[PDB]
Each structure stands twice: as structure tokens, then as C-alpha cells.
Amino acid sequence: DKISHKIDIPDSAWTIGIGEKFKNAGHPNVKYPMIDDSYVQGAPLGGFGAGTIGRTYNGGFSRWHLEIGKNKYTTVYANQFSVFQKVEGNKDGVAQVLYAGEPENGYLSSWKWDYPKESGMYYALYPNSWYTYTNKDLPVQLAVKQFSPIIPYNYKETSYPVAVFKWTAYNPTNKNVDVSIMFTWQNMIGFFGKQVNVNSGNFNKIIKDKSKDSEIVAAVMGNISNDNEEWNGEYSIGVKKVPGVDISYKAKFVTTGDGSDLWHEFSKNGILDNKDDETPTKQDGIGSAIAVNFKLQPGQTIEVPFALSWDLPIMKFGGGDKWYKMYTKYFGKNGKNSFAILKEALNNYQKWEKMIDDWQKPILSNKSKPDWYKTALFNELYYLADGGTAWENGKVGEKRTNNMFGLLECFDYNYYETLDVRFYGSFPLVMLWPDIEKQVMRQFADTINVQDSSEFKVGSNGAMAVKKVQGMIPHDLGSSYALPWIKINAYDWQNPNIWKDLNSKYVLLVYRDYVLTGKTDKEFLKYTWKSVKTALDKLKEMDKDNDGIPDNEGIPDQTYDTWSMKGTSAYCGSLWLAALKAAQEIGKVLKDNEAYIKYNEWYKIAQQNFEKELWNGEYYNFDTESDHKDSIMADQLAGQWYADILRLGDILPKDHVQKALKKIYEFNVMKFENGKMGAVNGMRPDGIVDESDIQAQEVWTGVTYALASFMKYRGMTEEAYNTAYGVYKMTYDKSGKGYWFRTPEAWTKDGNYRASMYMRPLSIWSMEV
């Protein structure tokens, strides 16, 4: 490996061998069907709300999130980079697809598949990833840096449906070598959203944009239809000329054939036919190819950028609504703009690289933090783009001021912005994209007094319940299978209108969003204030025994939606205390004296009773009335965690908080698989995992990262990082279970998982507060 020196890969990048087999991989631990796409994954490409494309460490474009809200894992084999090399003085060169695998059937059989093992590495530090190619049969060593412009405090480039592939080629040998790099791409119009005739009318065109010191050559792969539908638009691939390279192309090869129409050209001398052909296809799949060829002298390096763009302007949800995607604000809505997007990338990628470096640098340059922590912190952010993210720029046929946004809980549980989860998972948004965060919270504020008296069948018990109750915050803002933003509370396993955490978490998120954006946005507090008061007032009505605290009802009436709480719980009770303290402070800021007095009175009573009911001398009991009420819960003091972040001070005595956190580390972490797998949710005081429900026996990745941040704030530095380390290890390490780029909600002691690609572990960003 002599190429690594010619590029700049951070030491904290996650790494794996190209073609590596992983032997320890986890699988779902539930009875019902659940997504398991394998460990062959990678950092995604694509902006927020753009649809994303997961290119895996083996080189394949395989995890398709272009249909917003859906996860489709299938390798489109025509989509590749390939290389040709010929040493000066040799009769023949060699050509090789840079993919560690081969197609299942006979399509593209002429191409040279099966990129060999131990011949290159993949690296990832989201939003960047890299591949190096160090192959005994490729005298010139190659590397590519690939990325989308995901940039904090930037809502423009961050939305773009584009990727850049910046290639570096170096000749360490003593002979001249001819090199070609070729990008192939299938015209994927019809891959989704088209009910019949999936390739029909697809056609490919070549664009040559020649100006002074810029030549771009690109293929635009579209359809003859000018219809405005979810399925129609354009893909583009292309390259920018640099000194010392020539560009060749082929407008049309057949992907549903043996591929030799293209490969016989590339494998001879690495130069394509430059054959334009706009003939539309009928049944056959078609694709395009863009190549560069150059001669490298001994010791010479060259850099050349390619790009990919996709202009699919319309997203459709299962309930029928069609919306424009955010990037259409910048490029237009007609679906004929892929070249414009590509050109912007090819002309500006160096600036984008610097913008990414500028935001990563403060963390990367901090030598007090271990590299593993940086690996997780950056790579968990994959989910912000990869989570079925929807960001609208108008309803089709509809102009508002704001652009509604939603991130999925996950794909198995296809719900937008699940509030009990975003309480943990939304830290990157408030910290790095606060305008999006505030928009989402205003969306929630708008739902507070919505009433929907129609009934649904509750999954857990088969009872009928009212869909949406006035004054109760919704569980979620809908499903991609139905009507995001329009039909809320898609979730139906439990009735969230009687949950005892959502209303408090809502208030805490509001005040958080004020505090973490500088305590200056009084207009945001003003917008949400009525909803905050309503939410707390409705929750107070659920206090049955008049101890000042809402009563859990001996069912799973909160985020642990199969783990029953009864009476006063540490979890909901502490969230309540913190929410009251937050509302007091908002009342002071907004000069709402009567609110300040009321919530102060409720707080003083509830705080006294919380402490009396639950403090046992070592920790806070799980609750007052359940069978295992004395279980040690990892999340027992969630309200105090948020109070720390919100600078609300002590809602519970410092000494008792410290004792509880030490107990949690001693038990829920260190007595669970020797502290190497995170914090298990429930442990009995005898040091055995609480078996009352599956959720008690799970580690929740986002709960654990949040607990680590709580420990960190409280000066328990070793415990905090040791706690977090087990989550990093399980996710990323050779000794873990292979969950990179699909961090799950949960695992059990055997390492097997529930709900891959999950929002909650974004809470790792709470460690950066």
C-alpha cells in the first residue's frame, strides 16, 4: 500500500478489507419477520430528503433508499467503477470491475468480476468514505474519496441528490503505465414507482460542456415522457477533464445482455467508442459509461473527479400524497435537471471537501478523545440521510414559508419522528441543523389540539381506542405507507394517547431546543408555549392518587412499549419533574407569572413525593407498584439527564444521582457481559438481569449513549466512555456483531438484534453537549 500516503484518510475512519467475510454477524431476535440486509453495507450517498444510495464496502450500489421511506437491498450490477491498466512494453492490458462479487445470472457475464480479497481497503468517516486498490496485478495503485456535501448549518448543498468520486492514481513502479477508470450506470428510471413497462421509453444522452478550463462530459439517463410522477426524472454520471487525461464515453449499452457491447472496448485499450445514441429502449435495460484514460510515468500522481446525480423530484407516499423534494428549490421541479446538479458538484467539490473538513476538524483535532469515539460519533450520522428522510418543497399541484421534515424511527417500524425516540435521537439536528429541529417541533406543536375520534384496534390487546385525543402529543407524524405530516399516530401497538412520557418529553425537547441554540429564540418559545402548558395540564389529570405525579397504569404506557410500569415510575416521574422545571423557566422568560407559580407548586409537591416513594438509599426504584418494582433501570433518571443539558440544576439530590449512576454502571453495565455490550435496561438487585419482559433484557443503543453522556456530565468520565465503548464495539469492531451503517434499537446478551437502521443511537451526539 503506497497510495494511502497520497490521500488523507483520518485515523478514526472505520475500516474493513474489500471482499472481507465477517463471521460473527447478528440477526433479528424476534419471532416476526424483520429486515436483515447482511453486513455488506457502507456509508450512504445523497443529501437530506434526496433519497440515498448505500454503496457497500465491496463496491456495489446495493442499499436503495431512493423511494422515500422504503429500504430496498439489491445490487444493481451495472453500476460500477472499473479499471484498465497496461504496462508500456506489454502486448495486453488487464481490465477489472472494482466489485468483490459477481452477478447472480448471466447479465454482464463478459465483464471481469470478483475483485480479489486482500487487495484493498474500505474506509468511512461519514459523510466521507474511501476505497484503496492495492493489487499485485495493478501496477498503478488507485484510491477514491466519495461523499455528498452534508454540512452543518447548511440547508442547501446538504439537500442535494449528488455524490462526488475523487480518484487518485499513483505509479510506484519504474515503467510507464496506461490507466483507464470507467464509471458505468444503469438507466434506473422505472426501478421503482412504475406499475408497468418498467424500462419503456428510457433513453440516454451525452452532454459535453466545454468552456475555458472546464470540460465536463456526462451521460443523462432519462425517459421520453415529460410526465410529472414519482418514477420519472433523470440520473447522470460524468467526469471533469484535468490535465493529462482524455475522456471517452458510450451512451448506450444493454444491461439485460452480456455487457460485451461495452466491455470489448474497455478491455482492449481502456477507451470507449464515443458512440452517441438516443434511441429509447422498450423492454431491455440500458446504461451509460464514462471513462478517462491517461499515462502515468514512474512516480507520477493524478487526481480526477467523477460525479453522480439523481433528479427524481417527486416523492409519493402510500396514502396518495405527492410532494416535491427539498433540492427542487435549488434546481427546479420538472425532473430534467440532473446535468445541472452534476455540474455544480464537479465544479465545487473541492470547496465542499474543505467545508466538511472544517466541521469535522474541532472533534478530530481534540487529542483527549479516543479515535473509536470519533468513529462512532461521525458514522452514526449516516442515519440522518439514510433514515427515509422526507423534506418537502410543496405538495404536487399546491407556496408556504416552511419546508416540513421527517426522519423515520426505522424501516421495520415505519413511523416519522416518533417523539419518544427523537427525545434521544434528535441531538444531531438541534446541534448541527437547528432550523430543521425547530421546524419539526413546530410540527408537533400544531398537532397538540388535533382530535380524531375515529377508532383503531390496539395491537397489544385488541381493544378499540380513539386515534388522537385533544391535548395529548402524538406518538408520530405518520408513516411513508400512509400520509406523513397529514395523518399522525400511525403507530398502533399501544394507545399513545394515554402514554405518560410523550407530553413531558415534548416539553423537554422544546426547552432543549431553546437552550442549545443560545437561549435567544423567544419567538420559538412563544410559538410553542400554549402547547407546552396544554401538554403538562393534560398529564396532571393522570395523577390518580393525588401525589402530584401522573400514574403509570400497569401497562406499557411509555417508550418501553412492552415493559409495564405501575404507580410512580422513576422514568416517567423524573421526566415529569424536569418538564415542570422547564415550563417554569419558559414562564419566566415569557413573563407568564401564573404559569410559573402553578408549575412551581406542582414541581415542589411532585419532587418531594418522587424522592419519598422511590429513593431506596442506593438508587431510585423502577416504580412503586410493579412486581419487580426494585429493579435497577438504566434510564431511571432520564429527567435529570435532560435537566443537566437544559441547565435546570438539581431536580434530585446530587449525592443520590451519583449513587444511582454508579449503581447502574456497577450492575446494568458491568454485570452484563462484563461491560462489553452497553447497559442492559433492567437488572435485579441480586445482579441478575430482570426477566419480566424482553425489553428489560435488551440493551438499547440510544439509551446507552444517552446514559454515557449523563455520566460524562456528572464527572464519571471513565464510566461514561466504558459504557459507550460496548455500543461502539458491538457496532463497528471485529469482535462485534456487524451492525455498521445499520445500528439497531436493541440487542440481547447473545448479540442478536431488534430493528436495524434505528434513530435512537443518534443520541451519541448528546456526548458533545
Ligand SMILES: [Ca+2]
Ligand atoms: Ca400519582
